[PDB]
Design a protein around this ligand. Structure first.
Ligand SMILES: [Ca+2]
Ligand SMILES: [Ca+2]
Length: 93
């Protein structure tokens, strides 16, 4: 009803990816979230931790999707998200 149209369609829907990098409550919440996601205090967000955020939102992606998602989302293609990159990834545009 309110949300549907799950068809791939011919539309690029590229702007969809930008939506993820957008939509934020408060800069403070993002900073705190990093700590919560950094349970190992490694100072880095891994797929496991990255999924925690997606799962919390109710979004469920496959194992292959996460790998490709992170790689495509990772600007430095380092396979890992850094603090400086994390903040920007959320504060992007
Ligand atoms: Ca961590
Ligand atoms: Ca990175």
């Amino acid at each position: 009803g309110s949300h549907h149209h799950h068809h791939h369609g011919s539309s690029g829907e590229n702007l969809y990816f930008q939506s993820l990098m957008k939509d934020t409550d408060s800069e403070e919440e993002i900073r705190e979230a990093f700590r919560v996601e950094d349970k190992d205090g490694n100072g880095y967000i891994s797929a496991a931790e990255l999924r925690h955020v997606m799962t919390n939102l109710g979004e469920k992606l496959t194992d292959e999707e996460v790998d490709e998602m992170i790689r495509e989302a990772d600007i430095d293609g380092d396979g890992q998200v850094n603090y400086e990159e994390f903040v920007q990834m959320m504060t992007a545009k």
